[PDB]
Design a binder for this molecule. Structure first.
Ligand SMILES: [Ca+2]
Length: 201
């Protein structure tokens, strides 16, 4: 029986899914299954934990927004049905750009923590990485904690370290495969929830 990992926590949690062909279609299903497992362990509500789910390729698609006032069961259904892209490129810079200038353009919930879970399995072409550091620093200034999850041997290690070295909060998780997500799930959620503040008594 599932239990609320973030109980009494105030958190905006953003899931960023690598949409490149570095993940097979089945592997991408495992990634999505991970996201759903995560959501199952959260109390999704505007008053507690809010979620966002974005799949990024050369561009990005936001399947779920933080303000989307749909029932949790619906949000989890949407996440599990995110379409496989299998794009040649997954632009981390573009999706961090979207996270900075769209999702967190306005901080309407300052009393909550903001966490961006960047699930990476690829490495964007260098020409697309010109403004990467700027987006990462912009997110830091808005008190958005970016947590990189490097999956597989093709994950952009340089960018993972660039995010990690900013602050101890930006702890990076490294996995050899999507298959390892389930085993490290509870650890990851616990780390996330530990960063989130509690509601006052
Ligand atoms: Ca492979």
């Amino acid at each position: 029986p599932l239990h609320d990992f973030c109980r009494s926590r105030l958190l905006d949690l953003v899931f960023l899914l690598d949409g490149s062909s570095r993940l097979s279609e089945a592997e991408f299903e495992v990634l999505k299954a991970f996201v759903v497992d995560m959501m199952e362990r959260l109390r999704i509500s505007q008053k507690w934990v809010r979620v966002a789910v974005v799949e990024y390729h050369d561009g990005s698609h936001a399947y779920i927004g933080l303000k989307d006032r749909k029932r949790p069961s619906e949000l989890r259904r949407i996440a599990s049905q995110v379409k496989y892209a299998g794009s040649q490129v997954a632009s981390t810079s573009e999706v961090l750009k979207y996270t900075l200038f769209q999702i967190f353009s306005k901080i309407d919930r300052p009393e909550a923590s903001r966490i961006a879970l960047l699930l990476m399995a690829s490495q964007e072409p260098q020409r697309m990485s010109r403004n990467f550091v700027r987006y990462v620093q912009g997110l830091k200034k808005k008190k958005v904690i970016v947590i990189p999850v490097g999956i597989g041997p093709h994950a952009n290690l340089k960018q993972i370290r660039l995010i990690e070295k900013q602050a101890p909060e930006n702890k990076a998780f490294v996995l050899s495969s999507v298959d390892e997500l389930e085993q490290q799930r509870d650890e990851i959620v616990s780390y996330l929830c530990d960063l989130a503040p509690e509601a006052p008594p």
